[PDB]
Amino acid sequence: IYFKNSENLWKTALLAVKQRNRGPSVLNNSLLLHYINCVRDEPVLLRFYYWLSQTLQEECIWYKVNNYEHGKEFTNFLDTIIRAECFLQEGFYSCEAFLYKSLPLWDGLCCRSQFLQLVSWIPFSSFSEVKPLLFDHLAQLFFTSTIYFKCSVLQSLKELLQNW
Amino acid sequence: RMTLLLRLRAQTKQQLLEYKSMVDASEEKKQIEAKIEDLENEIEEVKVAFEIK
């Protein structure tokens, strides 16, 4: 099958032998994520933009059919996205392009801790060009949601300030 | 019954404010690019007015 051996009987002997010897596309790759951390090239952040956008769209349309169990792989995919951004230390250009698209539609609690960690990793833009796109919907939602979203945005924008 | 009464008083201190603001607006009897600039001026001088309040 896959490293399926009949040496299991010999493996007990191989276990004693080991004891005797002792006695005598890029998100899920941390060792390669460092490479793209070191290149702000086009053919690398454009293949990444395109995979990330089509994964934040297809897996977000996947919400509109289940919304219950798909909220644990997309959430665990957004978590890897956020971890990769924290390591690489710049907001992926597909994650503000996805936030700008999906913020007006966004409710308060749907991937709140994950959407409001993508807001923190946003490339530094002029406020006259980023406020209407994002901060006008993180205020439309800020003023209509409970303290646990107001604190989850003021924490989101607290990390956004640190990143900017 | 007193905490609920205080909630009533806080609600009607503000509904009265809404009524009086509308009454004064109807008592009162152009540059759309600046019609929002003298409008944003309000919510920066209103903001100081009912922030110190």
Partner: protein, 35 residues
């Protein structure tokens, strides 16, 4: 206690009613088209 705060609350309710009838005489019910 209640009798003191309720006097103020009902006085400003009288003001609420006075301003509502003031808003009941302007009565424009002004309309808003696409402009």
């Amino acid at each position: 206690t209640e009798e003191e705060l309720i006097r103020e609350c009902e006085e400003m309710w009288k003001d609420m009613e006075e301003c509502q009838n003031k808003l009941s005489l302007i009565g424009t019910e002004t309309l808003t088209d696409s402009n």
